[PDB]
Symmetry: D2
Subunit: 252 residues, 4 copies
């Protein structure tokens, strides 16, 4: 198969991509960093089993991989955006506007992009790596949330129509997924090093730990394998127990 993975360096890209590559797929990797040739180069060096594309814009990115690698069989729209809290009256309209464009409009394009070619041949898989915040909203983060829920309903609606040309559609919304080196959204520090953050993570995720790239990677590879296409329309909540709820006074 020929896959794509956007923002490979953040959120869930190195976990998706490599599990994808480990499975012998052709994985083209999009990252804004890959705008600088000094960058894309070392990446295509650090991971020779991957394919970092300089192509920035949605549709042209699809074009690079398709024309460079025959086509694109799976789309893993790993979308990211700085979740910078703010009571509603302190944000700005462009603040909300910029999250919808990077968490909502962005993946819609990629599909409006690759859509025709998967449909023509009757094959392809589409996966949005959204976010589990809607499943449980914190206070003061409305812009990023409404943005994530928007994408999730898109994947679900996108299935009632796409099951036609045999293209399963799903969305994996993460919460507390270890981003390691990446600041999007839970890096090693302090998330694993600090006692308050680790005690937080233990208290909020049922599993009492952070999530791994390998875990998400296994699911995308499984969804992207046709082994269970009948799962289409599903909104996967990869938050290891989250959101954990508050027990009454007394109950330890």
């Amino acid at each position: 198969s020929t896959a794509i993975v956007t923002n490979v360096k953040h959120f869930g890209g190195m976990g998706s991509a490599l599990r994808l590559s480990e499975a012998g797929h052709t994985v083209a990797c999009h990252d804004e960093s890959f705008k600088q040739k000094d960058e894309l180069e070392a990446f295509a060096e650090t991971y020779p089993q991957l394919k970092p594309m300089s192509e920035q814009e949605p549709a042209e990115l699809i074009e690079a991989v398709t024309s460079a690698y025959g086509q694109v069989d799976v789309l893993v729209s790993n979308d990211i955006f700085a979740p910078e809290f703010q009571p509603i009256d302190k944000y700005a309209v462009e603040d909300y506007r910029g999250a919808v464009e990077a968490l909502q409009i962005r993946p819609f394009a990629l599909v409006n992009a690759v859509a025709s070619q998967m449909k023509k041949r009757k094959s392809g898989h589409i996966i949005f790596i959204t976010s589990a915040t809607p499943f449980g909203p914190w206070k003061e983060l409305s812009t990023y949330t409404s943005a994530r829920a928007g994408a999730c309903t898109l994947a679900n609606a996108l299935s009632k129509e796409l099951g036609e040309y045999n293209i399963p559609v799903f969305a994996i919304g993460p919460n507390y997924l270890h981003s390691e080196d990446s600041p999007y959204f839970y890096p090693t520090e302090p998330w694993k090093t600090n006692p308050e953050h680790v005690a937080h993570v233990k208290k909020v995720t049922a599993l009492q730990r952070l999530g791994t790239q390998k875990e998400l990677g296994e699911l995308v590879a499984f969804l992207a394998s046709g082994s269970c296409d009948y799962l289409t329309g599903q909104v996967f909540w990869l938050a290891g127990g989250f959101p954990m709820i508050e027990r009454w006074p007394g109950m330890p």
Copy 2:
């Protein structure tokens, strides 16, 4: 209390506003047709208990109702849009934008301009008029539907930060809400006078009929009354027992 019904001429506007003024409120009324000094006077003649505003903009409007009627106690962001039934690749990426700027960005643009003045009084109510399409998505309407899901989620998210100031925030997701003269989204023509359509209503709705303005106006006014701010963060499905799932061969 002083209420604000947007697009009072369409969708849930006339239902809310007329019954909002019915329950005692000074209902300020926004509508794009009221940009013309002409129109703002046409509708006013039709309804003397309503107060039509010419202001189109979120901040100017709220600013106007503030300087016009003391404050803005209740906001009914009765949003509308005339999307399209298109296969993902048949929409322009521009089409999704507008859908988001409509069903999503506007309600937020309003909340962002009124939220400020409400938090001081530690009183107020926010009601979004959304859609019940996220509950049961239709193939080829991934825009309008998902945008609405964005508005719904933003409504629930905002409930998180606004309740700290005792401000309820809800969303009402209609479906088959008879709209009358308004082509948003179930005008009497032909949903009540055309055999094929009439039939589509009776077959997909539990009550088997379009809902009434009095019904949608009752809820809005019910929520806006203070009778149960404890529902805050709630999304109402005003789709009337809808959706109905087709049953096995033979079954009626």
Copy 3:
């Protein structure tokens, strides 16, 4: 008309049974204590506007309220059961049949009793008083929490078939709803008193307070009044914003 409220001395009992009477209905009231002619006489005493019953079984009560008061236009299955917090291997399978029996079996038995008459008169309103627990469970409450889920769903499944008959069915799932002296499930002792139970109830909710019987009643009477028929099949989370999710460390 005539409406019935089960377990009226508990849960959302008082709020529903006094508000329905306020709205103008003849409210036959059921309750465990009404087994004793004294209790029924003492209740009917304190509240000559409510109609306490002796009947204990589903068809028994409804058939009795039919012969005495003409018919049963509204039914509020105020269900309860003293929940338990145990590791699932600590429970006894019987304990689940107890939860299931009272939380799902009682409501189904009643509707199975009344459906018929409402169906013939194409008029009637059914309300279920459940919980918001299936939305933000608590560990070790697997019995009650899940049992309620089937009740929440029992209500939803019905609204589809009873809608061709013009009969709405609603599910009210509250939580942290102060119940006076009723340990079902938030008595003033020790929730409106004990600082420990005060800080907590004041924490998992966006409104920071228990919900009031007044809010439960307003909603019960709003739905039964027959003003918003179109919300049929709706489940209401009367949790006042519950739950508030533990934000990361360092955040207020």
Copy 4:
């Protein structure tokens, strides 16, 4: 590691035993007929790779598997009970008790029986094969719908507690699942051999095809492999798009 798969001859039961074993899992099965020697033996003889047990009571089944095969690492509760459509009032309260008993008490009891070992050792996978009816309740299948519901929350609620003992808990809820020979609940005829039903599935599912036993089995195997435990608490709608919402008039 050892696995159990109940009612193996029906529902998701076979795909379950078949895929699991192929993975290297010893799979101890359960099934009413296994109660008869000839029954169980032809099974042990037909499916040599499988390990059928004669034990049928939940309490009885566990100690026996834990005996012959040391322990129970994976619990797959494949709960059945034939659905009996009919208006709510024609239903006998015993027809809802019967549905729940077999769909809520049975799986609760199994975990009750097997938990502490999985908890004590701190490893194990719990998987409930419930249903997708609560996703799109057809008209008139109440009892069986709200039943699958409780079983679904049972799993979500349980995952919250067993997350400390590291035991993911899942609920795979299918519809249109091909049960080959089994009548539970989609057999060969007429689903794959009656233009009528092929046409029904052709409309209600997005993929206009039924769900294979292999896809279900494959989901069963992946969920208990340790590859994506972070999905703990997830309800999986395995219905290939069901339900497809009938769009407005004139649309193809």
